[PDB]
Design a protein around this ligand. Structure first.
Ligand code: SAH
Length: 245
């Protein structure tokens, strides 16, 4: 399981970008120095640092891979945010946060591990009423897509769905769909697939012969191809939800 190692040599493990994280932040108007924030599936904490540098309050990143949490705190350290930004090895399906105690729950390209609707449901219980939930998720841009891309997505994440369905689910889960925007293509190509280029040459050689590596490179190269060919039918959408009642 060196899948981790590879992604340690990258700015982020999923589509995204500073402008996008900030643009989504632009919709949350309840934050102060007393706000408790959580970023679920924070990976190395790249978006978590950009976030921490533009909002007040303490943030808690949570990720399944210890390797990412280690880089998370080390990076937090260099940036001096270690006081108000702590990394923690945990799982989104088994959180220990006091009920209705958070003001903001962040999650970029990580909610698929637990499921869109499931997350909306469960995480809700850790939010102060009027609190926010911001997550980026894979979506279909249309009601019709080719078979290649469709079955590819039915093999990885079956919950991918259209923006309209995602939105109603948010309303159904007891939130107000405050803001919803689709991510620019440069979030995949520029900030995700490209950085993955250099990473590979170095990774592959450091681990020459590792069967897992030779294939990881193949998975990434296949995803990039599907994207460069079907980018018009799918991508990521960011959702800012405000807990009801
Ligand atoms: N059950 C789980 N609980 C918490 N994190 C998990 C998890 N399953 C997977 N993850 C993490 O979810 C992240 C998905 S990749 C996205 C990483 C980061 N949010 C970014 O945008 O760069 C990875 O860090 C993966 O390790």
């Amino acid at each position: 399981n060196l899948i981790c190692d590879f992604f340690l040599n990258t700015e982020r493990q999923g589509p995204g970008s500073p402008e996008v994280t900030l643009k989504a932040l632009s919709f949350i108007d309840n934050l102060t120095n007393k706000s408790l924030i959580a970023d679920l599936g924070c990976g190395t904490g790249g978006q978590t640092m950009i976030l921490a540098q533009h909002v007040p309050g303490k943030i808690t990143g949570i990720d399944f891979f210890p390797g990412f949490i280690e880089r998370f705190n080390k990076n937090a350290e260099k940036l001096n945010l270690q006081n108000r930004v702590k990394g923690i090895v945990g799982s989104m399906d088994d959180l220990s946060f006091e009920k209705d105690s958070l003001d903001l729950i962040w999650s970029e390209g990580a909610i698929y591990n637990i499921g869109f609707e499931r997350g909306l449901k469960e995480w809700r219980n850790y939010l102060k009423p009027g609190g926010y939930l911001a997550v980026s998720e894979s979506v279909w841009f249309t009601d019709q897509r080719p078979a290649e891309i469709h079955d590819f997505w039915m093999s990885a994440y079956t919950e991918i769905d259209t923006v309209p369905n995602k939105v109603a689910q948010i309303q159904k889960a007891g939130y107000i769909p405050v803001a919803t925007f689709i991510l620019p293509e440069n979030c995949w190509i520029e900030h995700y697939f490209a950085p993955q280029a250099k990473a590979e040459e170095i990774f592959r050689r450091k681990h020459a012969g590792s069967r897992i590596v030779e294939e990881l490179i193949t998975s990434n190269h296949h995803e990039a191809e599907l994207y460069s060919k079907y980018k018009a039918y799918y991508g990521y959408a960011f959702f800012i939800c405000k807990k009801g009642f």
